[PDB]
Design a protein around this ligand. Structure first.
Ligand code: BNG
Ligand code: BNG
Ligand code: BNG
Ligand code: BNG
Ligand code: A1H7R
Ligand code: A1H7R
Ligand code: A1H7R
Ligand code: A1H7R
Ligand code: A1H7R
Lengths: 310, 310, 310, 310, 310
């Protein structure tokens, strides 16, 4: 008969989501109800019926009694877990009540930048029983597991949280319990609008104004400068993200501007070629194309992407 | 009858307030008076009436006597708390005197950048009893809890400190004590004046001087360069702050300049268009507008913000 | 007669490969089966036949019985190893079952940047018995040692994993066991294409378009600007890597552009020299060379490297 | 009768002085002579008369004997103190000899940037007795406390060290001992000369040379470029320092250049205005002012500061 | 009679040499043979003749027997030392065999940047006996102390390693043992050639080509731009190094270029002054100087340094 273990995991804080290293960090409380008959005791009245134990001596106790604790790992933990509380309460009955507060970092291998910055993502913590389900079953501690209401995370905003149980075969080849706390968040795009999109559109629009000057040299010098500008924005954006082998939506948008800008140069080179060759008045005829290919090439662009990537 | 616990928390240092990660860090002393009748002892004369204990053995003592300690957590702690002292003194009476010095980082989810850089903010530490108020009540240790007077924090300057008690329901569903040390600080704006405001005004004013040259090409080249300048200041400022989904006052000020600057380009494009079209003397007439739209567009700006955001 | 130790090492995560410091970091589980008859006990009917031990007390047990544990080191460990689990299970038989989960960083002195960014690399962890092979032999725990399938590492992609045994003479001058987990990964070049190659080609190609303007001044000013651009890319790339004493393929590609660009200047200086000397129409004759030396000098370049370094 | 405690604190290394966070870091040894009669023991002749103890068991000893240790804190410690040695030697007499080696970071709230980079500063470590001077008095361990002669700190250079005693009232309201190790260092200005002063003077002087070209356009374009240059130097320097609410000497020097440069623009705008208005030969007359206002405005500057801030 | 202690220190890795903070970091094994007759034991046929001990219980053993351990410190250790192994083996004879693996950072106050980047440097670790040479003598454990051949450090390359013994007077005023592991390394200059020297020479050489255009304006604009370029390289290089009060060879090389570049401006200003004054054909005569002062001023420079600093 497998004895049941009641796994609660609440997340008081999201300290931060480092999307470049594909992890997130949380202040969290873990809560475990586990009844061991064998840990039951009897108290004379005037001696409390609930014992309070440092995990340190609670385990040194289980080791004397050679009782098995339902040993667990956080499977997607990264680095150290700076514990605040590791505290046992034990009723006459032998119901163990373990609480574990901590800061730690966790793997988010659930990261899909395909649609960056528009993407929504899955963050999850895996609590695994080391021991199989013949010995210990994880059940859902009720009215606890979830996300608190002072997470302090400004870029992301959490759509929904789910709790569920399932199995693994990590160290055992017997099926073992895995309690899972999943949450999706999606990205507050203000930052991106404000720092990336708005500037780029300013640069593109102001750039276009200088077309009404009808100086093709000054257009080419301008468009050439824009190129480096975008190539910069290319490095601003690259450094938010990993060295992905896959192509972001952002990546398209930029290479988009690159292509246009290069052809703005090439086009105005050829308009300027015609002034150089005594066809000034023809270049002036063709000019109206050049002037209304700018906004259309960049709006043809807005639907090359918004279709291809939506 | 719940036995009372006397919670003092002093802050010797503000090591720093990291506003990008929305936390702060402090060197702090915690002080607890808690009388346990059962911890009372009797001393032969020539043996001190005050026992001095490593927390390590003080808890191993409480575990022998199966006495409950008023276990607490720092609810808004982030990461590890590098303790210096964890020291118990115990009178014949059984009055426990716990002292806990530490450096730690703390969540400041109280962060309102709406008015950055002019904002004032709330920093607070939450000390929670794990156990309900049926067992332990937190009371305010008098003549201790507050902030020291070499905090060493130069950007912020602390308006006031408040201490008060209240409840939580973190692990228990019984009401539990929470001792709170709140402080407000506000921001020394020297840095912002010196590095952001002064430059931007210089750039804007000097820029304007070159209008009296009456070269519309040279105005457009100039205003176009200012744009990138501001777009830079846009990234200087962005990196002090998180990737907020909300719009700073700073954010406005910049997008403010962006809008004007773009229209400075557009306007001087059109003045220059008139020289190109044999209306040089008209463009020269209109010029006085162009020359006194600069200072007014940027002072119309000073009240677009100072109203919208005050 | 040496007692055998059964060494399993699985890698649940690659937290990251820091190629500048020539190390990598992993979440990993170590598993050891080791039968000590002397640890055998009697599994009295009704009493559990499997003892569960904190490493802490398991070693304090071996120290009472003065039994030797097969002490091991991770030979290529760097810094601290933040352990999650260090857990012993011991049958009546005296079969010790040690599990050790951890995050740690590891030396990758196997790093060959000669072909960066095209290179493939060897990452390996060395688990050494401190004690010789007269006392303890490492054997391969079967159906465990390998790499998990949520590593979360986006730039690298793992070709293959190998496990094998061998010896060392680190502290002993007697031969000692070394269990080795090797893996090769190779680099997703998207990043490099997207951020380095594409831009550089844009700069080079757009640059070339402005040749059809037939302004040698404007070519020289342009090529001079490209130089600094590349010199920048030289610092972008330098800082992904160590301060190598050996010359990358990347290093060549850049110095490649440098050489061409400098000679583009020198060539167009001399074309412009001829306009200055009343041989405008000759410079115009020679121009066709200048215009079709650009694409050929940079494609002569594409096979100076692709041969020299392949 | 208060028993005396003999406090030695030597600083083997200055690991570094982080002036932006207003702290410094040191490798240090602490040494304490403290005679407890009650810890005295009797040596049967041929048995050693000096006991050597891990602090771990030395305190577990004091806890058995319920003897009070003269518990101390480092009052201006920041974060963790990575101890190397914590070692007790105890003679027949009962003379405790505690040694404590460590790396730690310390608050330097003694930081006066008013004269940066010319400033000299106070670094100090506070060792406080937790217990009052009715129980324990701190006295100066002689021929130990000071600074070593391989600190390895290159920017600062230590003028003098002082050791002295005083009181506090941190946790007690009884007077308590505080042993203090103060040192002043002052700043090797080479760095500042080499990277800040020399460049700025070059920029200013070379800039001035181009005046002898008598092109007022080319002066205005030049002075405008200098402005951004200085605005850069403004950010180089700002980031060495905190976000001070007070105004550095450095801050003046820069805003100095800003003011001049802006008025260089304004002046040459007006010289150029006169060429635009058919008064070319007058602008040429006035020119000699413009040419010898540059060196005088920037040398009028050298005594606006060298007086105001000396 | 002082009992002898046999000190071996091997360095498996150089994790890195941080030259800006003047330290280095190493994975290392420490090995100590120390015979204590008093720890000698006798066994029945069955119990091994070599006892294996956690340092934890080995010291708790020495504390029972009140035996003195030859306590040591790493004198030039910085921060924490993340230990992997701390393992005692003890023969019947009472020969203690302590092994200590670790990562730690170490002071290199042996740092002479005078000749940067050409400099060679001394790295050393100091292992000190706390106790004098009346009690414990350090002797050299043979066939161990040295450096391994997978250090993994790419910029430096180790010339030679030395071991020797000597004394200190750190805490004692009696002479005490200090085992020293010294190594010299020198710097792979590839990085510096590739990123600093090559560019600077390109900039200087290409710059010179544009002289054959015979446009003194375009030379002055060019040389002025070079200045800022070098002033940038001045900040690249400054930040590899500390804020030394002493002047690098690098520092000279840069200030070298600064001086020349400024005088290139000044000279071409004066050539251009002569065109402005109707002496165009004279400036053209003098030009040949200007054109062959560039390569000579910068090669006169190559021996101003290579003599002054060699
Ligand atoms: C690239 C294709 C078409 C021409 C555009 C090139 C730039 C136009 C003039 O600006 C200059 O650009 C340099 C690098 O290009 C900068 O280093 C320099 O400070 C800037 O003054
Ligand atoms: C840039 C959009 C604004 C266009 C309006 C005319 C402004 C032209 C001046 O800026 C130029 O821009 C390039 C990058 O675009 C820079 O490389 C170059 O140093 C700079 O001289
Ligand atoms: C801005 C100061 C106003 C006073 C007059 C000086 C004119 C200088 C404007 O050209 C600048 O050229 C740089 C090329 O390196 C650009 O990067 C920069 O954006 C652009 O503004
Ligand atoms: C070096 C090869 C010969 C031609 C190019 C000369 C040096 C680099 C060109 O960029 C220059 O750099 C400055 C920004 O740093 C600008 O102020 C300047 O106007 C711009 O043109
Ligand atoms: C390895 C775990 N930290 C040990 C533990 C697990 C469950 C309970 Br209930 C108590 C202790
Ligand atoms: C910080 C730990 N909860 C330990 C503790 C022990 C005693 C008292 Br009084 C308060 C707390
Ligand atoms: C050095 C290791 N941490 C100690 C140890 C090794 C092997 C086994 Br089986 C148990 C404990
Ligand atoms: C809190 C300190 N770690 C305890 C201590 C202080 C002084 C001496 Br002497 C020994 C121990
Ligand atoms: C500082 C060390 N913890 C003490 C030590 C040194 C040497 C030997 Br042998 C054993 C212990």
């Amino acid at each position: 008969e497998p004895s049941d273990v009641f796994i609660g995991l609440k997340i008081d804080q999201i300290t931060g989501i480092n999307q470049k290293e594909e992890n997130f960090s949380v202040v969290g409380s873990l809560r475990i109800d586990w009844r061991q008959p064998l840990l039951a005791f009897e108290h004379a009245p005037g001696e409390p019926k609930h014992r309070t134990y440092t995990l340190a001596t609670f385990l040194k106790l289980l080791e004397e009694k050679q009782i098995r604790w339902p040993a667990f790992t956080y499977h997607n933990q990264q680095g150290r877990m700076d514990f605040q509380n590791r505290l046992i309460s034990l009723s006459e009955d032998g119901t163990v009540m373990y609480l574990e507060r901590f800061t730690s970092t966790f793997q988010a291998p659930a990261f899909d930048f395909r649609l960056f910055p528009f993407d929504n993502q899955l963050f999850f913590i895996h609590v695994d029983s080391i021991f199989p389900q013949h010995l210990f079953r994880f059940q859902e501690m009720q009215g606890f597991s979830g996300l608190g209401d002072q997470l302090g995370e400004e870029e992301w905003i959490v759509t929904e949280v789910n709790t569920h149980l399932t199995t693994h075969n990590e160290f055992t080849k017997g099926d073992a319990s895995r309690f899972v706390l999943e949450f999706h968040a999606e990205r507050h795009l203000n930052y991106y609008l404000m720092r990336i999109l708005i500037p780029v559109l300013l640069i593109i629009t102001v750039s276009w104004f200088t077309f009404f000057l009808q100086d093709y040299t000054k257009r080419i010098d301008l468009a050439g400068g824009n190129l480096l500008l975008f190539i910069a924005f290319n490095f601003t954006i690259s450094s938010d993200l990993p060295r992905l082998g896959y192509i972001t939506l952002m990546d398209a948008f930029l290479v988009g501007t690159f292509i246009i800008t290069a052809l703005v140069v090439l086009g105005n080179v050829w308009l300027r070629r015609l002034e150089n060759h005594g066809k000034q008045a023809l270049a002036r005829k063709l000019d109206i194309y050049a002037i209304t290919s700018y906004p259309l090439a960049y709006l043809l662009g807005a639907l090359t992407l918004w279709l291809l990537f939506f």
